[PDB]
Scaffold this active site. Sequence first.
Site, mmCIF file in Angstrom:
data_model
loop_
_atom_site.group_PDB
_atom_site.id
_atom_site.type_symbol
_atom_site.label_atom_id
_atom_site.label_comp_id
_atom_site.label_asym_id
_atom_site.label_seq_id
_atom_site.Cartn_x
_atom_site.Cartn_y
_atom_site.Cartn_z
ATOM 1 N N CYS B 65 46.895 33.315 20.127
ATOM 2 C CA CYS B 65 45.659 34.089 20.081
ATOM 3 C C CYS B 65 45.085 33.977 18.672
ATOM 4 O O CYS B 65 45.643 34.528 17.720
ATOM 5 C CB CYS B 65 45.916 35.540 20.469
ATOM 6 S SG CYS B 65 44.441 36.474 20.890
ATOM 7 N N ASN B 220 35.727 52.882 42.035
ATOM 8 C CA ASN B 220 34.507 53.350 42.681
ATOM 9 C C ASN B 220 34.353 52.765 44.079
ATOM 10 O O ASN B 220 34.368 53.502 45.070
ATOM 11 C CB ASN B 220 33.289 53.002 41.826
ATOM 12 N N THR B 221 34.218 51.445 44.173
ATOM 13 C CA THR B 221 33.997 50.798 45.459
ATOM 14 C C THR B 221 35.282 50.180 45.992
ATOM 15 O O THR B 221 35.584 49.017 45.709
ATOM 16 C CB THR B 221 32.911 49.727 45.343
ATOM 17 N N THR B 226 42.284 55.345 46.221
ATOM 18 C CA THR B 226 42.471 54.612 44.975
ATOM 19 C C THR B 226 43.942 54.560 44.585
ATOM 20 O O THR B 226 44.399 53.601 43.952
ATOM 21 C CB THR B 226 41.642 55.254 43.860
ATOM 22 N N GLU B 291 35.312 46.672 36.967
ATOM 23 C CA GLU B 291 36.588 46.800 37.651
ATOM 24 C C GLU B 291 37.563 45.709 37.241
ATOM 25 O O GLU B 291 38.786 45.917 37.242
ATOM 26 C CB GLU B 291 36.376 46.768 39.167
ATOM 27 C CG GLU B 291 35.090 47.420 39.632
ATOM 28 C CD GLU B 291 35.183 48.926 39.740
ATOM 29 O OE1 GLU B 291 35.787 49.563 38.852
ATOM 30 O OE2 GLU B 291 34.645 49.476 40.723
#
Lengths: 573, 320, 304, 67
Positions: B65, B220-221, B226, B291
């Site tokens: 990295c 959310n969706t 969840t 998400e």
Amino acid sequence: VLTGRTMHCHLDAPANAISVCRDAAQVVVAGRSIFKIYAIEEEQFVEKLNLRVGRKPSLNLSCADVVWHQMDENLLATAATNGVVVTWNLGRPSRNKQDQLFTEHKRTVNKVCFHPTEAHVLLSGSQDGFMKCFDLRRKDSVSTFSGQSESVRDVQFSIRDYFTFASTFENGNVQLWDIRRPDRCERMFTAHNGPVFCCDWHPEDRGWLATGGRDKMVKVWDMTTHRAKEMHCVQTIASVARVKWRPECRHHLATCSMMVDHNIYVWDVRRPFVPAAMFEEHRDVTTGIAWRHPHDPSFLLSGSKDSSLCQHLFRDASQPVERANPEGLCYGLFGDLAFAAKESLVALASSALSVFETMRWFVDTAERYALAGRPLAELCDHNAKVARELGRNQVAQTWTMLRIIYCSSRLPPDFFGVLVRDMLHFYAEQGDVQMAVSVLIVLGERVRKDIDEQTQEHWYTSYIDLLQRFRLWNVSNEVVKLSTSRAVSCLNQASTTLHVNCSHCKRPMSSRGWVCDRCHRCASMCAVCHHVVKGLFVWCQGCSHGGHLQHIMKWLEGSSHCPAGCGHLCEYS
Amino acid sequence: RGPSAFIPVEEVLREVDNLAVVMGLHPDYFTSFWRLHYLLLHTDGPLASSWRHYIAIMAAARHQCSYLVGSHMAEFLQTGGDPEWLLGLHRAPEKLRKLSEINKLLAHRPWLITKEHIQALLKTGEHTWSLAELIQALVLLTHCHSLSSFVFGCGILPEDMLCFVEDPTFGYEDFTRPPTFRAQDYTWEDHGYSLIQRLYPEGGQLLDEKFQAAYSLTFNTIAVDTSVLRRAIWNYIHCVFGIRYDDYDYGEVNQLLERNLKVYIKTVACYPEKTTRRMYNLFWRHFRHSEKVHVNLLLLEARMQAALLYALRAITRYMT
Amino acid sequence: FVARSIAADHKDLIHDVSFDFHGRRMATCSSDQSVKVWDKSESGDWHCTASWKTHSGSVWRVTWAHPEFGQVLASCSFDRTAAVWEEIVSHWVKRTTLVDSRTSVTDVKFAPKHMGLMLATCSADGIVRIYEAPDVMNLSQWSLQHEISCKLSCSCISWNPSSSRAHSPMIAVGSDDSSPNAMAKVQIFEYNENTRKYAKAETLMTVTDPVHDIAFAPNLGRSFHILAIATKDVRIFTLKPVRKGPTKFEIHIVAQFDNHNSQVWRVSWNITGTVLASSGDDGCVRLWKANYMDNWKCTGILKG
Amino acid sequence: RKPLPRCALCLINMGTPVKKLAQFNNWFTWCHNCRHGGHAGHMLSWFRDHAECPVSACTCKCMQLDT
Ligand SMILES: [Zn+2]
Ligand SMILES: [Zn+2]
Ligand SMILES: [Zn+2]
Ligand SMILES: [Zn+2]
Ligand SMILES: [Zn+2]
Ligand SMILES: [Zn+2]
Ligand SMILES: [Zn+2]
């Protein structure tokens, strides 16, 4: 009643549960890879049964807890890590002893419980949050409770009250239900800061509980009133896993830890700071404890995670109260003495501090002695007069005699060169380095190349430390200045130089001068008298202003403002 | 052009100054992460600051990295470090060139860590370690590894390494190619918390507060609830490293996870240097852009927890 | 002389009392997991200025540090830890915590100032460890240097306070275990500048009953060493180096007193190293001194 | 975070926090000719009975250069 001694046996797999029946002769050991029954005869453990015969290594036998009923000596109940509750029926013809396999829980089950009298009741608590109450004749089905806190940890049925049971949750709350109304709890209160692992009721009281948690604490609660009150509080050194009350002694407990600590302790709640006993036989974390009989307070059974099972005798523990040091002692600088001791040996849980008011010659000789400045004779006479006026006669005679030897055919060049050395060593051996160092400084070069280089250093350093204890910096620095050894002379020379800069141009200033090189302005201006400061300069680290040493000192004892007028309170007072 | 090469700049505007703006889309987690970072790298503690930044450099260079390595060497130069140390590992003292063996195992194959490594680190000699000095370094190494994984996963733009590492071709090998770690014999909440609190209290408190912020993060969706697919992803990534839960039925993993997501997770976790844009776009085509960041946060937390649990079990076996 | 009482307000027993370098502050530790600091005013009365919970178990010992490094205190506890505290501008804060022990830590001691900033701790498992702080400007960076391993359970340690450049550092450690056998209870370890390691130097064979405290004497002028032991009786030894591996000593015995007819618990020298104070189970403090013929008499009996 | 210069009499490093909280006796003080410093109270007490720089091998009459 009963009889036995300390004994132990080695198992095949680690165990994490235990239970005893109403005969005090049998015990159950359960774990992830073991489910056996043993017998406590008189001198050893004998292994009767092995309820894993028919080895189909199902995950239905990884027990986390096990209970034995105290009405029927044939019922058993374990709690698995799948979410199954199995009830065994020992009095059965077959080799397998399984009876029922309730599978109504989704996540891991942690605890199981039986009713003390009615021999058809079960209570199970799981990691989901709900707790169920089966009925072991298949009538009336299950009844479900909801706690809405977290994974539950323990469940216990009250000893006196018939219809009440307790619960302990991972957020730190304790609720109290009745089994004829599975709709709302009858109480709730915060007990610990974090998960609560264990609880227990009092065998003799009516509203006394005992909870233990992960915050390393054991609390006792009173529930006879309308609100829960906390009486006692024991602070252990690790997290608490199990808490059991001792039979027939209403102020005793037994705890084991969940990490780091392998011991088993017995506490007295009226002395929470020191344990009353400790068993230290195991070599890994203890997992389960149980008192053998409800009426014999001298037998304890334990099962640990090193494949071992043991029985402990209370009259063989390691009492740590009568193995400690009862007093402390210290000697001061000014001659004081501090002595604290127990209140049972002087005149059993308190102490008694007392200071005894048991070296003025040192501090009076240090100030009045003269070391340099005049020739030998007057220095010797001055020191002799001082010593005589203080009351030390031999030192005065030594000072006087040291003048006749030096300050005055013939006697040979150095006839006394071998006696002053002996005098110095004589004075230094008794611990009086003041006289030796003073004589060494006064004489200077006539005794110098006779004493080894590592002895003068020792004598100088000891004297400097003793002077610094009494806070006499003038004499210490005087000695450092006129020291005969280079190592001592180089003590106030390391890192005592300051660097100063002009705050108009932000440039360093030369080592000797009061005018800036670029700004061509004088920077050592006095903030009071407005003259040039060529000598001592005082400075304030807050607002960066200052002046003459004795000007700011007088200004600051009449006001509390920076004289340059920058709105600063330089002493913050 | 802006913060992230994968998330469009308009999305970031509508929803180390780059990582902080791409991770800010979930406020309740950023605060905890920054608190832990400040404790681990800036507050005074058992190790010197320069040593801490060098440890960060060594840990971030395993996954290659550039972002973190550049930032940490810039910080190390200005705290009073030795510029000679930046020529390679062979110029550092023989007390930092001992962590280089536990580095690989924590980064690549956690399941091989045993008590002999701890004994080798704490064995008496001329350059030794203390328990606090080493428990800080372990947490630091895990933190840097997880940060590198997230940075590569989200595709962050900027604004050598081979000299800071031994055995550069170790890599990851699949588990099934060793006993299984049952997640009920040694749990964080009951076992690891207590030990890490006794040996390093403030760090333990901050880690436990950070673990509970990545659990209460709603989706959310979704379309069950969840709490279900979160459990599925968590259990899958733990199972990759060799930990199996007893209560969980593992069949639902396929029925709840698309086969496209299952590869993104493994790529970003095990080999984070090979993640690319097409992979980022293959899974969850028609879903919001905030998400695919929550998934990364969950993955980071899971990797941290697995490595910490293995190291703590090793230490407990050593001390018993 | 005169005795004045102090109201400690401790909920359990007091285990240690310590003075400071300038002689005007005092510290007390108890089994209620607390530490108190006292100050002395112009009127000559002691009053408390701080008190705070320090450990999670019984605190055994508390010691001061040289005022060159600041106002620093160290403590040891039953919960297998040792802590360093400092006073900043007035409350006391925690700076470090040493957690390498596997059993209870029994004593803690600061090294003499000319070695730097060093600390030594002893455990009930028989291990003695020596720490160091290489940079005085950060009091939160300690590093383990040496680790000795005795065969029995330790109870007390003591440093040699000599400041000469012809004496190498040494530390004496004593045991307290009661066994049916007869093994030596006091050992002395010495430092070797060539091999850079602590090595065994001498063993006090005559001492067989359990030991409770030992203490070297403040040198200030001498070429040999004096050691005091608090066993069932009071014993005083002498170690003189021989002219020139570990240095060879000639150990003798110079005093033995069974005047307490009890068990002796504590010993303490004075600032010049000439008077010895001892405390016993009877409840009395006794003072010992030596004349020019090397005989050790008694000087006073202080009773509480 | 490196030590500030130390006093020439008590050999203890100088400093000031930044009831009284910074009293006069603990302020910096230095000669402007030879640049040798110390605490204000320490130097005030020293320069009463002596007249020479407290540091060894120095020659300044650090107080007579003004009066
Ligand atoms: Zn200028
Ligand atoms: Zn002026
Ligand atoms: Zn000003
Ligand atoms: Zn000011
Ligand atoms: Zn000057
Ligand atoms: Zn000067
Ligand atoms: Zn000063």
